[PDB]
Amino acid sequence: DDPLLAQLKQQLHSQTPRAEGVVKATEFGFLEVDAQKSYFIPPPQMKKVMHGDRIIAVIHSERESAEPEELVEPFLTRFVGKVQGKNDRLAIVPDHPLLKDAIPCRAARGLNHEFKEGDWAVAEMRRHPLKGDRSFYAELTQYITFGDDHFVPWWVTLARHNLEKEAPDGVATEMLDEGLVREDLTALDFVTIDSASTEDMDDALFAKALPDDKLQLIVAIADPTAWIAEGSKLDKAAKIRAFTNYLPGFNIPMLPRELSDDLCSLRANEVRPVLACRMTLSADGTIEDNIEFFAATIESKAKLVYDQVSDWLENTGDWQPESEAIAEQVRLLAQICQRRGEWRHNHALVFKDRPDYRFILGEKGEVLDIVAEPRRIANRIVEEAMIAANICAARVLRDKLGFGIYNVHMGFDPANADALAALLKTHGLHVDAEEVLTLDGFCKLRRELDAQPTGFLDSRIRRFQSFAEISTEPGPHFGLGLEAYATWTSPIRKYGDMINHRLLKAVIKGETATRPQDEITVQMAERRRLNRMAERDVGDWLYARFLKDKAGTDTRFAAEIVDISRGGMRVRLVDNGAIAFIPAPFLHAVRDELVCSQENGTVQIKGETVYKVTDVIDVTIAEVRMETRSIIARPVA
Ligand SMILES: Nc1ccn([C@@H]2O[C@H](COP(=O)(O)O)[C@@H](O)[C@H]2O)c(=O)n1
Ligand SMILES: [Ca+2]
Ligand SMILES: [Mg+2]
């Protein structure tokens, strides 16, 4: 360089052949530029990069190779990992299954903690060879727990998603004067129906028979917002959290315990403030326009338990209602459930029973068992009432406000409707490209797709399915087969439901109301996504623990094929819900006679279909790698 010579070398440097792509590693790696273009990265060039870094590289020939030059976006930022080789030099291996190398690190200042071998930390990347640094380097920013802590699962997972490990701090109660007029519901025979363990009754039922074969339902929901003022510390604390995070064996509540457990909870034979909704149902099950929201106080008559209620109703088991009054409430409520089920059957969509697996844990967080808790009438009684109540709120907020915290499902996006109909044709199912975009046509497709003898064709259109949203705008819910949809029935566990509670309270008083900001539903969606990941990561750890001792044994498990790709089949164990992977080479000896097609949902050997997505097969457990929590399964025989 030399101003002339420098300008020249610059212009030369600038026209050097280049490519942008994502780094893929293993033994050297590749710069994956697109679907059918990749460049070999030699292992010396490897050193500059991490798996998954988005980079620009010099392309070299003379055999072509990519020589990394510039970082576009690093794979790794904030992460978790296990520390090594102590303070005389710390390094950290990311928990990332594809990131195998130790990264030199040190503790952030103020981090009191003396790190040892095995310790779990949260860390931040600070240096990268492509940013000119000699080495990769990270700062440790948080001490997690020690390497052989039994409670690893929980603490590492909460930390990795940066989620809170604690309930919020309780604040001196005193009930707020919102100038509500509370109807005295106290004489009435309200009952709660929850599982056994529950001490935090959110909700509350009362039924009454009417002339013309009608039924009256009142849903009474607990009253947190009668204590928590909009703008208070608990407020802003609850809003950040969005939802109680339910993890195997462990929840982190949105609200303080005293409030949840005690003051708000609809405990039997105690007087409680409530937000109530009285609805009138046709013989049809139809929710009539008769909808009345109002503040009230009730006194639960009977703290009921699901199984017991399900038993009494099927004339099985030992348990009877404490009185005729309660019996009649249960009977009326079962009648309501029946009409609503029918209604949703006929006019909406009823979701197909998905086993809900519960981990049964011991004191050191061991897995005793994982059981699919099946659903019985008492469960459906509650669900049908909660759904009708939430429909009620959606209508009234839409009507009286024009806004609320709504749950939103747009159906198939218009730009994918043609591809949709074409794929169904190839499988022999007629549907229309523009009818399926109407609520009615979406429901008709769903219905006949669930009359399918198997889930195959179903599976074929997962790729077209939209997901459930959060909106302040009233809107249809195609998944539920409903014009509208907003929840207010569990405000102690959901910030959105508290917001709707305050909105409904404005409507009741004839007050004006402010529309929630859209950043509202954005943060809510982010925490939901977080909580779901947190629960599956827990579960994953747990499943590995549970299945470790089955490794290499001939224990069989029936398993549903959930996904098929290039490298093999993902599989869900029917009896416990664990995820396992079956590598392609396990399915057939001769690589070139085997085709696992992601796009078809099939595995073929010598041109003949042997496996399909939704098939159930029997597998054994080949491997449980505790490092990565991965379960490897092999088909039987
Ligand atoms: N596109 C991607 C791919 C991975 N990464 C991160 O790499 C992280 C590495 O996980 P660990 O925290 O276990 O090392 C992932 O959990 C993910 O947050 C990312 O931030 N963006
Ligand atoms: Ca790793
Ligand atoms: Mg309840």
- 200 assigned to active site: yes
Residue 440 is a catalytic residue: no
| Lookup result for tokens 């041109």 | 607
Distance between Cα 581 and ligand 1 center (Å) = 21
Among the listed residues 189, 202, 311, 497, the single catalytic one is: 202
Q: Is residue 275 a contact partner of residue 223, using CB atoms and an 8 Å limit?
A: yes
Catalytic, 194? Answer yes
Task: Give ranges for CATH 2.40.50.640 in the chain.
Answer: 76-148
Containing 141, the helix (H) or strand (E) segment is strand 137-143
> CB-based contacts of 231: which residues, under 8 Å, 6+ apart?
none
Instruction: Report d(CA 399, CA 391) in Å as an integer.
Output: 12
What are the strands, taking DSSP E only, across 389-446?
A: 406-408
Which of 485, 492, 496, 510 has its CA nearest to residue 274? 492
What atom of ligand 1 comes closest to residue 99's alpha carbon? 14
In the set 53, 119, 203, 311, the catalytic residue is 203
- Per DSSP, 409 falls in state B
Best residue among 73, 96, 103, 537 to mutate for probing ligand 1, ranked by most atoms within 8 Å of CB: 96
CB 45 within 8 A of CB 70: no
Going from the Cα of 236 to the center of ligand 1, the distance in angstroms, rounded, reads 29
SS3 content of the chain, % helix, strand, coil (to 5): 30, 30, 40
Ligand 1 pocket residues where CB is under 6 Å: 52, 75-77, 79-81, 94-96, 99, 160
Instruction: Tell me the backbone φ, ψ of residue 246, rounded to 5 degrees.
Output: -95, 120
User: Which residues lie across from 464 on neighbouring strands?
Assistant: none
CATH tag for 1-75 (out of 2.40.50.140, 3.40.190.10, 3.30.2130.10, 3.90.180.10): 2.40.50.140
Q: Is 592 a catalytic residue?
A: no
| Last residue before each gap in the chain (C to N over 2.5 A) | 27, 62
Q: Which of 469, 492, 290 is nearest to 396 (CA)?
A: 290
- Residue 591 is a catalytic residue: no
- In sequence order, what E strands does 235-291 have? 245-247, 250-252, 271-281
For residue 413, how far is its CA from the centre of ligand 2 (angstroms)? Answer: 38
Residue 456 token pair? 């195959």
**What is d(CA 251, CA 254) in angstroms, rounded to the nearest whole number?**
10
| DSSP letter string, 98-127 | T--S-EEEEEPTT------TT-EEEEEEEE
Closest atom, ligand 1, to C-alpha of 76 = 7
Taking phi over 0 as left and psi of -120 to 50 as alpha, with beta for the rest, 8 belongs to: alpha
Alpha helices in 84-215 (DSSP H): 152-160
The secondary structure element, H or E, covering residue 425 is helix 417-426
CA quadruple 475, 478, 484, 490: dihedral sign: negative
Q: Determine the Cα–Cα distance for residues 16 and 212; give it in Å rounded to an integer.
A: 84
- For atom 4 of ligand 1, the residue with the nearest CA is 75
Show contacts of 311-316: CB within 8 Å, 24+ apart.
313/377, 313/378, 314/377
Q: From the CA of 634, how far away is ligand 2's center (Å)?
A: 24
Mutational pocket test of ligand 1: of 23, 75, 162, the residue with most ligand atoms within 8 Å of the beta carbon = 75
- d(CA 625, ligand 1 centre) in Å: 20
User: CATH code for 76-148?
Assistant: 2.40.50.640
- CATH for 551-637 is 2.40.50.140
CB contact at 8 A, 554 and 566 = no
Quick one: resolution in A? 2.4
Beta pairing class for 214-221 and 245-247 = unpaired
List, in order, residues 6 or more apart from 531 with CB less than 8 Å away. 163, 242, 243, 245, 246
Residue 193 identity (one-letter amino acid): I
Technique behind this structure? X-ray
The segment(s) of the chain belonging to CATH 2.40.50.140 are 1-75, 551-637
Q: How far apart are CA 291 and CA 47, in angstroms?
A: 67
Q: Residue 284 catalytic?
A: no
Tokens at 403, concatenated = 């806004």
